[PDB]
């Protein structure tokens, strides 16, 4: 926002590419960790019903 108007297009494009790379890694890691939780829920928290 504080950057000059002439520089916002170039810099903003590099920020979004880095931001999307981090967001991409987070999304799949969240899915991986959720899948592991769902796979381990039956045994780790089982009870005698």
């Amino acid at each position: 926002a504080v950057l000059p108007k002439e520089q916002r297009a170039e810099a903003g494009k590099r920020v979004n590419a880095a931001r999307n790379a981090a967001q991409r890694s987070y999304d799949e890691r969240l899915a991986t960790l959720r899948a592991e939780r769902d796979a381990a829920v039956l045994v780790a928290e089982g009870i005698d019903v």
Binding site: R34, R37, D38, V41, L42, V43, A44, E45, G46, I47, D48, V49
Partner: protein, 834 residues
């Protein structure tokens, strides 16, 4: 809709023709209308005003510039030698117009006192009033302009406006289409007050105009259901003429805006007599007028300028060039009366009520004409209403009535619109009412409403009038007599009901289940049958899960919630979130309702004739066409199950509390259940039990899956239960306990098993081996210490042995215990603790 609005003054005038001097208070009129069956939605008195409210004439206008909005400094003639200077922000008037002036000292509704003001650098000596400021009508955009000749300057405003009037807003039931007019309502009041009625549609009140030849060539396809179609011209009307104030005022108080004399007259006569009327510019008609069904893909532009997609069941009026009207719904723009129209062809038609209903609902056009035609219009008054229109239009617009008339009345022509006669015993209304009416009551009341009545001994032959097509059966005639005599005369006596069987076992069980859950701390809710959007996606159910096979509503109140519930849990979870989100975090809810579980695609059954009873096969077919709808009981829990207090911090909800809910329901149903580990969304796969009665599955209980909890925004640890009550058979046990007077023997037994062995399986094996000497068994210890071994557990049961006919020795009890130990070794692999 069913709304009928009319001013009392007009209703009184029509009643007073046959009952000179008739006049009742609005409170009594409202009660009389209610007593005979007409719902009064609102009674709206006009005004009131007080002080100097007078008619004025705008004699000059000075435009005041330099302000936000255009402002006018007006010199207004109020009938004396000193014109008043009045400031007004409205722009809908010109020099020479008649207006209504409230002078300083006047009081307008409500409590608005008028005084001289200093506005826009000028001195305003009063105000020019709008219809809304006078409580005459709703118009507030501009001020009220009276038509030329309505009064002279200086005339009393309240008198010219008739502000002592009262407007009645009625809701007419769909069996009384004849009451959507002053004619019908006045006739009803004449019946209620035993007055002589002069029919405003009769030849004495509307003397027939000459009939010297046809008015316009016409072809009618009788398959359209049109019963009558009449035409008469009025030539040489004055384009500059405007309807007189008495006519524009009555239209306004009935909710209709005045536009021009030709249209105003057709609307006025429609309100007066109940027969819709339409004015065509005859000079814009090209060739023969034809009444026919619309063809596929045909369209027409109605006089509102909107193009209408037509159906082959829509009835039209057409000429050689274009469509002239959607019959009984709205006229077309092609023949519409315009400001320069000078020759008019008036249309008085009777359309098929069902055809109009279908057409107007498809096109969303519930016009004043359509809602009358769909409730049936009296076909006998078509030419009367036509002649009434023609004579009134010619008078107020300076025209001439043409002595020509076209009047199609069917092939062959119908010269008598009498419905079929009805035979009824003279005492039938007395029997149904339980009242012995005075002699001749039934015949007098039925003649009052317009029927022809003849006596054949004890049997009446009743021919209803043409405006009462709702009178078809003796029961219809009974209602007429009873409502006019007043339902208050009907006594109150209890019927002779037979000895009943009371509540069924299922109805009784539902009460007992609800009492037990409530006493155990559960709060009942009423579950909504519409599923939250995408709830099964939140649960992660498979695409082929039977709960996804839902019945869907075509027109739900929320377009994203059309499906009906196959399970009660979504509605319970939604109520749990409502409670928790508002600060009530420790909650236990339950519900008892039906679910909707279809077994096929939505399949309908054709209409079965209602003149007979449906056969048992037709009944079973109607039942088989419906989705299965069994009764369920369900519950949800979150937060603390036991509250904190001076005993301690309380106890959070756990899966065992859901299992206990199952046992509460089971004890209330007097059935034995078993619980077995299961996997079944949305439950936690390690904390889920499937519930069985015998070998039949009846539901599930336990803790909800943590992923479902996260995606659904539920409290952590939320637990749930759902059982199918229809799958639980109604039981009626008859116990015969035999209390043994001999002492018992107490022993405990400790057995080591694999961790996956259910404790109930160990108890079952112990019971099977111990035999009949075992009176009671109770688990009181589950030990997984280090001396036991990994993936194993020690269980200790308290055993109570008692013989029915002797005292036992310790060896006798130990022998039964040892057989229970061997039973457990064989069935669950148990090892005696050591």
């Amino acid at each position: 809709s069913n709304a009928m609005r009319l001013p009392y003054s007009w209703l009184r005038e029509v009643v007073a023709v046959g009952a000179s001097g008739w006049d009742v208070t609005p409170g009594e009129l409202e009660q009389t209308l209610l007593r005979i069956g007409h719902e009064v939605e609102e009674v709206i008195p006009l005004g009131p005003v007080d002080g100097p409210v007078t008619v004025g004439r705008v004699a000059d206008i000075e435009e005041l510039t330099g302000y936000k909005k255009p402002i006018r400094a007006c010199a207004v003639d109020i009938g004396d030698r000193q014109y008043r200077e009045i400031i007004c922000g409205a722009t809908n008037f010109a020099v020479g117009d008649l207006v209504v002036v409230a002078l300083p000292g006047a009081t307008l509704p409500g409590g608005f006192t008028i005084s001289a003001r200093k506005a826009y650098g000028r001195n305003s000596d009063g105000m020019i009033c709008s219809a809304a400021e006078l409580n005459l009508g709703a118009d507030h955009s501009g001020i009220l302009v009276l038509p030329p000749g309505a009064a002279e300057p200086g005339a009393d405003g309240a008198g010219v406006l008739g502000l002592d009037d009262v407007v009645f807003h009625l809701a007419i039931t769909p069996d009384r289409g004849y009451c959507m007019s002053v004619r019908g309502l006045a006739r009803e009041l004449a019946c209620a007050y035993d007055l002589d009625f002069v029919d405003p549609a009769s030849n004495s009140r509307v003397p027939p105009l000459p009939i010297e030849g046809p008015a316009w060539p016409l072809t009618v396809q009788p398959e359209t259901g049109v019963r009558r179609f009449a035409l008469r011209p009025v030539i040489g009307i004055d384009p500059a003429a405007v309807s007189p104030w008495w006519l524009q005022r009555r239209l306004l108080l009935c909710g209709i805006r005045a536009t021009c004399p030709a249209v105003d007259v057709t609307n006025y006569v429609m309100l007066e007599l109940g027969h819709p009327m339409h004015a065509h510019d005859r000079n814009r008609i090209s060739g023969t007028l034809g009444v026919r069904f619309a063809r596929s893909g045909e369209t027409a532009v109605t006089l509102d300028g909107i193009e209408r997609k037509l159906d082959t069941a829509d009835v039209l009026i057409v000429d050689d060039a274009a469509t002239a009207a959607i019959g009984g719904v709205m006229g077309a723009a092609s023949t519409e009366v315009r400001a320069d129209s000078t020759d008019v062809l008036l249309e008085a038609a009777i359309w098929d009520p069902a055809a109009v209903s279908r057409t107007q609902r498809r096109l969303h056009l519930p016009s004043e004409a359509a809602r009358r035609y769909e409730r049936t219009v009296d076909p006998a008054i078509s030419v009367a209403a036509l002649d009434r229109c023609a004579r009134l239009l010619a008078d107020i617009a300076g025209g001439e009535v043409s002595p020509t008339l076209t009047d199609w009345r069917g092939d062959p022509p119908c010269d008598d619109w009498s419905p079929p006669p009805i035979r009824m015993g003279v005492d039938v209304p007395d029997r149904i009412a339980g009242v012995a009416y005075p002699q001749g009551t039934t015949a007098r009341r039925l003649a009052q409403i317009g029927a022809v009545v003849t006596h054949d001994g004890d049997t009446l032959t009743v021919t209803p009038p043409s405006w009462r097509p709702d009178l078809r059966q003796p029961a219809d005639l009974v209602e007429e007599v009873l409502r006019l005599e007043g339902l208050e005369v009907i006594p109150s006596v209890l019927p002779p009901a037979p000895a009943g069987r009371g509540l069924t076992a299922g109805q009784q069980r539902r009460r007992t289940i609800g009492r037990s859950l409530a006493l155990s701390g559960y709060v009942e809710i009423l579950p909504t049958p519409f599923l939250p959007a995408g709830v099964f996606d939140l649960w992660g159910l498979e695409a082929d899960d039977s709960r996804r096979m839902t019945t869907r509503v075509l027109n739900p109140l929320e377009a994203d919630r059309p499906q009906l519930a196959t399970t009660l849990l979504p509605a319970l979870l939604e109520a749990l979130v409502r409670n928790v989100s508002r600060g009530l975090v420790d909650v236990a809810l339950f519900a008892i309702a039906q679910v909707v579980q279809p077994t096929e695609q939505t399949r309908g059954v054709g209409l079965i004739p209602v003149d007979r009873r449906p056969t048992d096969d037709e009944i079973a077919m109607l039942d088989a066409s419906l989705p299965r709808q069994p009764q369920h009981v369900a519950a949800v829990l979150a937060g603390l199950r036991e509250p904190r207090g001076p005993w301690g911090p309380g106890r959070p909800v756990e899966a065992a509390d859901a299992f206990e809910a199952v046992r509460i329901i089971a004890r209330a149903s007097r059935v034995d259940v078993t619980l077995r580990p299961a996997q079944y969304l949305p439950w936690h796969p390690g904390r889920c039990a499937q519930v069985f009665v015998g070998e039949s599955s009846v539901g599930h209980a336990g803790q909800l899956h943590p992923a479902v909890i996260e995606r659904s925004g539920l409290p952590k640890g939320t637990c749930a239960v759902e059982l199918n009550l229809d799958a639980i058979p109604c039981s009626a046990p008859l116990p015969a306990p035999r209390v043994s007077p001999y002492p018992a023997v107490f022993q405990d037994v400790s057995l080591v098993v694999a961790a996956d062995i259910p404790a109930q399986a160990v108890a079952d094996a112990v019971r099977a081996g111990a035999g009949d000497l075992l009176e009671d068994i109770a688990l009181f210890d589950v030990f997984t210490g280090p001396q036991i071994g990994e993936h194993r557990k020690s269980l200790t049961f308290a055993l109570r042995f008692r013989a029915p006919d002797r005292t036992l020795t310790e060896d006798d009890a130990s022998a039964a215990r040892d057989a229970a130990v061997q039973s457990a070794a064989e069935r669950v692999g148990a090892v005696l603790r050591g």
